[PDB]
Amino acid sequence: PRDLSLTEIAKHNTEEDCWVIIKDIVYDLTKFLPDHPGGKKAIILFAGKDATEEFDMLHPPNVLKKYLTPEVVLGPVKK
Ligand code: HEM
């Protein structure tokens, strides 16, 4: 299908093509990378993976809503 399955998500695992799962929502962070105040590599480390725990422990609850636009919010993981 090429939808938001874990299999498909895992393929977006480079700086050039970087998806990250946070609370079962897929974000395309490729263009956000140079904009990230925590640097590119911290996110690239989690490219194609779930970053929920590390995100929750490193950021205030208000960050997601203040830094991202709808164009990078791809949707929920398909189980
Ligand atoms: C989901 C999209 C994300 C947004 C909008 C975002 C935003 C930010 C912002 C605004 C800061 C500076 C304020 C702060 O210290 O919290 C920051 C710092 C940081 N972020 Fe991100 N972040 C995102 C994803 C991630 C991911 C996936 C990681 C990897 C675990 C990460 C790791 C870090 C680290 C290590 C810092 C430095 C913390 C410090 O020096 O106090 N972030 N993030």
Q: How would you write the chain as a 3-class SS string?
A: CCCCEHHHHHCCEECCEEEEEECCEEEECCCCHHHCCCCHHHHHCCCCCECHHHHHHHCCCCHHHHHCCHHHEEEECEC
- Domain holding 7, by residue range, is 1-79
Annotated binding-site residue numbers for heme b:
59
How far apart, in whole angstroms, are the C-alpha atoms of residue 49 and residue 9? Answer: 7
The residue to which tokens 């203040």 are assigned: 66
* Nearest Cα residue to atom 10 of ligand 1: 37
Experimental method: X-ray
Domain count of the fold of the chain: 1
**Residue 25: CATH number of its domain:** 3.10.120.10
With a Cβ cut-off of 6 Å, ligand 1 is lined by 20, 22, 27, 36-38, 42-43, 46, 51, 54-55, 58-59, 63-64, 67-68
Residues 6 or more apart from 29 whose CB is under 8 A from it?
A: 18, 19, 20, 36, 43, 72
